[model samples]
Structure formats: structure tokens, C-alpha cells
Target: APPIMGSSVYITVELAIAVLAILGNVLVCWAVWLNSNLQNVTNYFVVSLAAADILVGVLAIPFAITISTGFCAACHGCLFIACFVLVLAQSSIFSLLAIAIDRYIAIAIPLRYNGLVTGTRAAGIIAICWVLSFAIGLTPMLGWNNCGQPKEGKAHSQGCGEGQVACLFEDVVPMNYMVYFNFFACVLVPLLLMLGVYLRIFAAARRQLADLEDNWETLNDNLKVIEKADNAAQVKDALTKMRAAALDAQKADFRHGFDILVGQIDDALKLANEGKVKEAQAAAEQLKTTRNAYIQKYLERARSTLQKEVHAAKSAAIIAGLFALCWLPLHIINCFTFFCPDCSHAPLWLMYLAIVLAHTNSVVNPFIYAYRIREFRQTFRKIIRSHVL
Candidate 1:
């Protein structure tokens, strides 16, 4: 049969996506490698996910296009391609799960996140994800496929034509495996777990923000108490107590400011005792300026750290949601086919669209990173400015 002209458009789009996926994911890996700030447990899993996307572009997309376009007719070759695609897809899913878990730990146990999800442990988790992906992905190839099966009312064994196999995906791969084992067990379950994890992460993040707000409120109350002190005696007493409190709190950054405030208070006290009331008032006003400046600087630091956490959590949640949006259609179609075989079939264009959407997930993650992650955005800008432009 001649090639469909409509398919040329699909092929063009797919090729473009493959190229973008390859380039974008490569940049992700490279950015993580060259930038120290990007070298964390979460980013390690991100690099792993990028590796899978790169392979999808380099291998899976090409193989899928070739097999689906009827250019590949050999049984074993198509089987290998299909299994390899599964491996890469499963690895991507597993990598996403790992990233979600990492984020969960970072948010939930914050202080212990670094200690628990160390570099060596991250490497171990990556290794386990890949190994488990291979085990699950290759199961169909290990005597579980429809390689020698015959369809109902179809005379041909092995589900192939006379001279050439014309190996299509559904004909070679069993729907039961795709629906039950792959979708429900592997993909859907992990996705749901990731969803729950992200929800908990958001909740924990909110709780942390609330705690920080309470601490800030306490600082505000202390500032108000100091500001209300009218006379030199009252101001000196407050400064002396606050200086001790600051020391006890281990706020080393505020130590210099506290010392200056105490010195001002002492000068004001001496001047007040000496009857230089106006000069004492000026010194007291200067203390407010210095104290407010230090407090403002500390507030800015705390706000930035909180914003960073919120941004990371939001980005991971978006990535997980996008993964589901891109991949679920194809799995739904698989389920539709499996549970309702007698119903009207899904159109070829719809299937192709689903496949394209699934592949699009591999291409969009770098964009998400650039948009949501400050570190990635800066590094990407640096790379683009120095290299791409």
C-alpha cells in the first residue's frame, strides 16, 4: 500500500517533537551537570527522567514511526523496538515517581531530607528504577506476547501476513498486558501515589509557611515592645534584654545590629541622666533605623527561602499533572479496547493523537523547568546566551 499523505503531516510533527525532546532533555542534563545548585537528590531524578526522554527521542519515536508506518516488517525487530519503548516509558514514569518522593521527603521531613536522600542513595534509587523498569518492560518479550497466537476468524498464525509480518504494536503486544499490568498496576498506581504525595507536600509546605509566619509575628511583637519604650531607662532595659535574647536565639546575623542598638541605648541613657533630653531622643530614633534595617533584611531572606520552596513544590506538581495529561489518553484507549472490544473502535487519528500527546510529555518538561525553576532558568539562559545564540 502507498503511504498516506495525511500521515506525512503526522510524521513531520513527530519528527519535530523528537528533535525538541532530544535537545531540551540534553540541555536539562547538561544544565544539571554544569551547575552545582542543580545537583540535588530531586535533580538527580530529573536528570534520569531527562535521560529517558532523550532515549524516547533518539530511539523510541523513530522505532514507533518506522513500525507504525509499515516500514518494519520483521517480528523480532519490531518486538525489540516495542519493548525498548516500554523500557524508556517505564523509566520515565519511575523517574517521575522518584522525583515526587524526593520532593515529598524534602517538604515533609525538611531537616532530614538531605541526610536521608543522599547522593549515594539517590544513585541507588535511580539504579533500582531502571532495573525494575527493564524487568517490567521486558516481561512481554519473554514469552508473554502474541507472537504465536491467532486471532479469532483469522487463519494466519502469529497474526502476520503471508510473506511479511507488517508488525503493528497491538498485534504483537497483548492488550491485557498493556491494560492490566502496564496501565493499572505500573502507570496508574504510581501516578495516583505521586498525586497523593504532591498533595501532602503542598499541605506540609503550607504548615511550614504558617510556622514561619508565627515566628515572624513573634519577632514583630518583640519589635513593638521595644518601639513602645519611651524613656531612656525603659529603652536601656529593653535593649539589654533583647540583646541577651538575640544571643540566646543564636541569631548571629543580628548580633552586630543588637550591639549597636545597645550602644545607642547606653548613650541615650547617659545623655538623659545628664539632662540632654533632645540628644537622647535623636539617639533613640537612630536605634529604630538600625533595628528596622536589620529586621527588613532578615525578613527578605526568610521570604525568599519560603518562595523557593513554594516554587519547587508547584513545579513538581505541574510536571506530574502534565505527565498524567499526556499519557492517560493512550492508556484509556488501551482500556477501552480491552474491556469493550465489540464497541466502535477508536479512530486511527485519535490513536495517533494520543501517541503524539504521550511523546509531547517528553518534550515539555524542560520548558516547565525553565519557567518555574529559578536555577534552571538562570542556567538555561546562560547556556542559550553563551552557546545557542
Candidate 2:
């Protein structure tokens, strides 16, 4: 596809996933924080991870797509590929870096990982990641302090906002300080940190997985118990799916339900018109169950179980951190674009290659976020079903 043409499907998927990512991440965060059974140290980081992905889904992707489809900055005036894009992207990258680091400490020191990486501390780290991303993003806002030039759009009339004092770049658009900062701050630091964390996970999982074979004392009974729990969890997840399905089904049935209800209502109206009180009551009674019955306990159980799974371990955190690995190369490429000067010699289409690679993270995240979260998987299926209808 032409560079412009590829963006069409790219925009569609990015936008759609943005909606799902935001909703899913928010639910993950809410479940992690508010649910009593879920309030654990591991969940604290999961919530933070969700917060980053949520911002990426809600803020980053749409803004990028808008810029692509809507011809942003060109239409909006000076500044923006909207500052938030650079800012939030950098922020989320670093936030995941922090999550990676936290997970490392957790696995390396399981007994004290909880105490050292408590929710309050997790909150602090998340705050710091954003702060650093924000500060780096704000460099251009602070006026040519340090950075490279941004890709310029044609502007006429009485000059553009680039010279407006606030949007000044200390260097060239593709090879200057602002872009330089975005390159390193958003990309490199997180990359190195997350890669290191992932190596730790590989080593850790390797060492720990061996232990999976060492224990056989109650293996069969353990498997039986696990199977039982899984059954319960599945039933509960089914109930949530059922409830969401039911509620959504109920809404979808609205047009038909209303038609039936109104027919009964009309019959009652006629009956009343004829002063037939008993007949009117019978008409109203006919409108009673236009909806399917729901098992509230089952739905609640499913929701709880799903929430339980997302909060269970450091694996999700580790997987999400590995995502940082895939993104690192693109950031490295971006950094080179700013100072390597040779980067300009690279094909414009080649530039798109790096971005396309980065976009893979979008779909990859649903896997990482949904990795082993069975409950999340069930909820996600419901989410997909809701979207399809």
C-alpha cells in the first residue's frame, strides 16, 4: 500500500483498539484497586501498567490517527502533532520501564518485593515516570532550551507559531534538541531498562520452571484442586459473559421489546377505553418478561474471578515489559533520526517501516495484557461480541 493508503486500515484498527484498550485497562485498574481480594502488591503495578496502556489507547493513538487523517498541526496552527503525543508516548514508555524494574525486584526478592514495592511506592514510581516524560516533553514548551526541530507543515500569512517564542526548537526539525530528547527520553532509557528486566525474567522463569518438576508430593491432588478452581472460575466467567450478553441483548431487544410492550399497552388502553378494568390488568401482565432471566451471583463470580487472574502474579507485568523490548529499536531509530544526520538519507518509506513496527505493539498488547488472564479473556470476548453487534 501507498504510505497514505496503509494509514487507512492502520487508523481503523488503531482507533478501534483505542476504545477497547481504554475500557479494558480502566476495568483492570479499577478491579485491581477497589476489589478487596485483588488489593495486592502485584496488582498495584498491574494497575499502573493499565494506566499507561489506557493513556496510550485513549490519548496517544487517537491523536496520532487524527493527525494522520485530519491533517493536524497543519490545520491547527503552530505546535502539535499535539504536545501530548510526544509527551504521553514518552510517559507510557517510561512507566512500563518502572513496571519492569519493579517486577525484577519482586521476583529477585519475593519476600521483600511486596514491602519494598508497595502500592504507595508503585504510585510514586508511576508519578516519577510521568514526571520525567512530562518534563522531557515540555522542553520545547519551555522555549528552545534543548531539542531538535519538528516536521514542519506549510504555513503562510503572518509567519507561523514556530517563531512564536513558545514553540521554538533549539535545532533542526529532524536533527535537533527537542527530537533528540524525545528519542532518548521516550525510547532509549525505557528500552535498556526493560530489556534488562526481561533478561532477568527469562533467567528467573528458567530457574523457577525447573522447580515445577521438583514437587510431586500432592501433584495429583493439586491438579484436582486446580481443575476445580478452574471450573468455578469458568462458571463465574460464563456468568459475567452471560450478564453482559444479557444486558446488551436486552438493549438490542429494545426495539422488539418496545414493540411488544406497546402492543400490550395499546391493548390495555383499549380495554380501559371500554371500561374493562380486569382486561387492562391482564394486558399489563403480558408485558412482564420481555427480557431473559439473569443469574446475578454468576455474573459477579465471573467478574471477580477475572479480576482475580489479572492480579495473580508478575507474569503479566513481565510480559508487558517485554513489549518494551519490541519498541526499543524504533526509538533507537528515532534517536538516530535526530542526530545521525545519515538518518535523512534513509527512505521516507523506510521511516514508515519503523513506525509500522511500533504499531505492532498495539495488537501485541492485547496479548500481553490478556496473556494468562482467563477472566480477562472471557471479559474480552464479551467485549468483542459487544463490538461485533
lDDT tens readout by residue for model 2, 1-389: 56677767677767776777687677666555444665665556566556666776776676556554433133222234445555665666665666566656755565676678777776677778778777776555566432233334432232445533223211222345434566664566666667777677657645543433222222223323323432334323322332333343233233554455445545645554565545555554453443222222333443454334335335555555556655666666655655687546455455445544554454454465466666556555655677698
Compose the digit string of candidate 1's lDDT tens values, residues 1-389.
Answer: 35577688778888999999999999999999999999988899899999999999998888878767644355556678777878888998888888878878876776687779899998998999899999898888787787676343332443545434556788778899999899999889999999888888878777766765654465456455555656656555544554554443334166576576566667766775665655665665675676587755665665677667778888888988998999999999988999997988798889889999999999999999998878899999998899867
lDDT of 1 at 255: 59
RMSD of each: 5.5, 21.0
Give me the runs in candidate 1 sitting further than 4 Å from their true place: 1-3, 70-76, 151-164, 218-300
Q: What total of clashing residue pairs does each candidate reach?
A: 0, 10
TM-score of 2: 0.54
* lDDT for position 159 in model 1: 52
- Give the CA lDDT, 0 to 100, for residue 222 in model 2: 32
For candidate 2, give the lDDT. 0.52
